[PDB]
Design a protein around this ligand. Structure first.
Ligand SMILES: *[C@@H]1O[C@H](CO)[C@@H](O[C@@H]2O[C@H](CO)[C@@H](O)[C@H](O)[C@H]2NC(C)=O)[C@H](O)[C@H]1NC(C)=O
Ligand SMILES: *[C@@H]1O[C@H](CO)[C@@H](O)[C@H](O)[C@H]1NC(C)=O
Ligand SMILES: *[C@@H]1O[C@H](CO)[C@@H](O)[C@H](O)[C@H]1NC(C)=O
Ligand SMILES: [Pb+2]
Ligand SMILES: [Pb+2]
Length: 188
């Protein structure tokens, strides 16, 4: 609906402050009216449309970089399910940084929540996703600032409809740590 904006580059802005000149103030970001629009549908895993309450969405990813998350910013992915159970301790010890490859080909460390706009209301890419642990040689990947995801093993490029990132608990030998990991669909 929003001119020249893929649905997966949008965020729900119904809670944003609607200004006088018609533009919006979304979490400190000025969103021009042209980048906004009403939606009465939300794409689903199968790329079909479903109905939802007439709400206003904004194409914020064209204004500030976005991170394609699987769930709300403070949830953890537990074996493919969004789980809101992070203790204050985990929230403090978790690694909030993502390595994003920029257009000049360089790598930049970015805080997932403060330096990027977390998209969490998008449909789950599929049921039973597997996750990549880039500490293993076959699990390496590249995450571009523009949203493109590249899986090294089979050199396939995934768009925002096919992957999502989320905090996840990894085993540290005989300990445990939380880091953000990408989730892909095995057969989809
Ligand atoms: C997002 O960035 C990626 C990587 O910078 C773009 O995809 C690359 O496009 C070049 C163009 O010649 C290809 O040679 C590369 O092989 C592509 N890399 C991958 C991993 O696909 C992508 O086009 C950008 N998306 C947008 C909308 O600009
Ligand atoms: C709306 O007002 C803000 C400041 O209050 C201004 O920065 C912005 O450019 C205005 N919107 C447009 C479309 O000019
Ligand atoms: C980003 O790169 C650092 C340094 O190589 C690495 O230790 C860290 O695991 C990476 N971050 C994520 C979320 O994979
Ligand atoms: Pb826990
Ligand atoms: Pb693996």
């Amino acid at each position: 609906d929003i001119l020249e904006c893929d649905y997966f580059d949008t965020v729900d802005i119904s809670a944003a402050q609607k200004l006088q000149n018609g533009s919006y103030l979304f979490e400190g970001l000025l969103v021009p009216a042209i980048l906004t629009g009403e939606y009465d549908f939300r794409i689903l895993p199968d790329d079909s449309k479903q109905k939802v309450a007439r709400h206003i969405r904004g194409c914020v990813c064209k204004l500030k970089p976005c991170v394609r998350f699987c769930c709300p910013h403070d949830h953890i992915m537990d074996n493919g399910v969004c789980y809101d159970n992070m203790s204050d301790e985990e929230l403090a010890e978790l690694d909030p940084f993502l390595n994003v490859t920029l257009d000049d080909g360089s790598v930049s460390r970015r805080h997932f929540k403060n330096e990027l706009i977390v998209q969490w209301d998008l449909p789950m890419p599929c049921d039973g996703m597997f996750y990549l642990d880039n500490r293993e040689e076959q699990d390496k990947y590249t995450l571009f600032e523009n949203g493109t995801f590249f899986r090294h093993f089979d050199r396939v490029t995934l768009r925002k409809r096919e992957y999502c990132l989320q905090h996840l608990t990894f085993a540290d030998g005989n300990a445990t740590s939380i880091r953000i990991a990408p989730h892909n669909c095995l057969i989809v």
